[PDB]
Amino acid sequence: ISCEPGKTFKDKCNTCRCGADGKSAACTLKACPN
């Protein structure tokens, strides 16, 4: 995984906040159809 540090992006149907190291992130835990 690679993302812009601290940036609040959106995965499939879940939203996430990129880790303070652009190497990880925290996301909501919903199930997405796709």
Partner: protein, 239 residues
């Protein structure tokens, strides 16, 4: 409330185990028009279900109670329609704080040995860090969607120890658990985190968010029910 007719068996969601059918009677599944399971939830009485605000439930979704194996068609389940959705006014979609929503059913649920309610705590209740509690759900077991309801035991952490992991993301209306070998995962959202108090299972957390990879070394984050019970009571009292 909080006493299942069919006692659950714990030998002590990623790295969890299959539960005894019907041993977690308050666990419901939230499904869309197509029958797709997208979130979990908990019955608190015959007419109400509590889940997460971020699940985005609408009066067009369905509540399925008394289920164990989602791939089966011979179980005696109850498909309940939703009358009204009550999202907590303080829910912040950017911080995911105050992540709680109430669902008023358009048709009351019929309690039995596989369908009953979980107990709610008092705002002042003390659930000490280190306590071993339980979380359940139909979320991923590996980064693989399970047919059968899974369960896992895990310890509650203190917000001070959780901040070591998540920093300023941890608000007062949040409680953490895990980082002990198991982990909540996609599909678990809205589900319960329960602890036994004075002999009865009590709802202390609602699956909210966590590691995007469901790491078993990072604590999961749940909405702290004790900080939200007053709101629940007011809502119920007015409807």
């Amino acid at each position: 409330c909080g006493v299942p007719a069919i006692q659950p068996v714990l030998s002590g969601i990623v790295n969890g185990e299959e539960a005894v059918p019907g041993s977690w009677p308050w666990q419901v599944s939230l499904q869309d028009k197509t029958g797709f399971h997208f979130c979990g939830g908990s019955l608190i009485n015959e007419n109400w279900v509590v889940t997460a605000a971020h699940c985005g439930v609408t009066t067009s979704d369905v509540v399925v109670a008394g289920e164990f194996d989602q791939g089966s068609s011979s179980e005696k389940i109850q498909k309940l329609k939703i009358a009204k959705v009550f999202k907590n006014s303080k829910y912040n979609s950017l911080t995911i704080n105050n992540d709680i929503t109430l669902l008023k059913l358009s048709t009351a649920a019929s309690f039995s040995q596989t369908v009953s309610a979980v107990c709610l705590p008092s705002a002042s209740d003390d659930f000490a860090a280190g306590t071993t509690c339980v979380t359940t759900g139909w979320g991923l077991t590996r980064y693989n969607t399970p047919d059968r309801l899974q369960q896992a035991s895990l310890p509650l952490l203190s917000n001070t120890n959780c901040k070591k992991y998540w920093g300023t993301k941890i608000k007062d209306a949040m409680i953490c658990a895990g980082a002990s070998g198991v982990s909540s995962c996609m599909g678990d959202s809205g589900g319960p985190l329960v602890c036994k108090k004075n002999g009865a299972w009590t709802l202390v957390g609602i699956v909210s968010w966590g590691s995007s990879t469901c790491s078993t070394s990072t604590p999961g984050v749940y909405a702290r029910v004790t900080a939200l019970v007053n709101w629940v009571q007011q809502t119920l009292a007015a409807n």
